[PDB]
């Protein structure tokens, strides 16, 4: 419900601040801090292993959601787990940072809406059947 938008807005605020951007220029605690550290650890591994998550994606406002939906559908095509959820947040976070980087800051509120919608309809089910967000802080708590 609203706790998912609370989590999505918090993560996007954190990732936008790492490059100097403020959330208001465009628009729980344990679960937030756990996702922030896990999302930070994920981006460092992805940049180390492969490349930047979005700089190679040639993103335009007309192909924004068109690219967002094909990535999250493939990521959760054959199941859902906690690490894949961390990959979901880090991808959408890196998408907003690229949107402001490419002068498309109108996409920040759109990506925020697309993520919170997918979290409620397609990931929140799996959240509850695996113990809720309390399991995420149990596993990613230090």
């Amino acid at each position: 419900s609203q706790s998912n938008r609370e989590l999505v807005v918090d993560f996007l605020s954190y990732k936008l601040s790492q490059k100097g951007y403020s959330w208001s220029q465009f628009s729980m605690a344990a679960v937030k801090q756990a996702l922030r550290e896990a999302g930070d650890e994920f981006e460092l591994r992805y940049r180390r292993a492969f490349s930047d998550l979005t700089s190679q994606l040639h993103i335009t406002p007309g192909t924004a959601y068109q690219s967002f939906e094909q990535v999250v559908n493939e990521l959760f095509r054959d199941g859902v787990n906690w690490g894949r959820i961390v990959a979901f947040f880090s991808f959408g976070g890196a998408l907003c940072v690229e949107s402001v980087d490419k002068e498309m800051q109108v996409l920040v509120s759109r990506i925020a809406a697309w993520m919170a919608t997918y979290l409620n309809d397609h990931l929140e089910p799996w959240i509850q059947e695996n113990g809720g967000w309390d399991t995420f802080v149990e596993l990613y708590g230090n």
Binding site: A38, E41, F42, R45, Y46, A49, F50, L53, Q56, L57, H58, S67, Q70, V71, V72, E74, L75, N81, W82, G83, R84, I85, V86, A87, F88, S90, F91, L139, Y140
Partner: peptide, 23 residues
């Protein structure tokens, strides 16, 4: 074509972070 590779790499590092944490 680049999005399909990005989606792919997000899986592998997502499943690795999942299996690593679960042990």
């Amino acid at each position: 074509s680049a999005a399909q590779l990005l989606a792919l790499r997000l899986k592998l590092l997502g499943d690795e972070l999942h299996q690593r944490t679960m042990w």
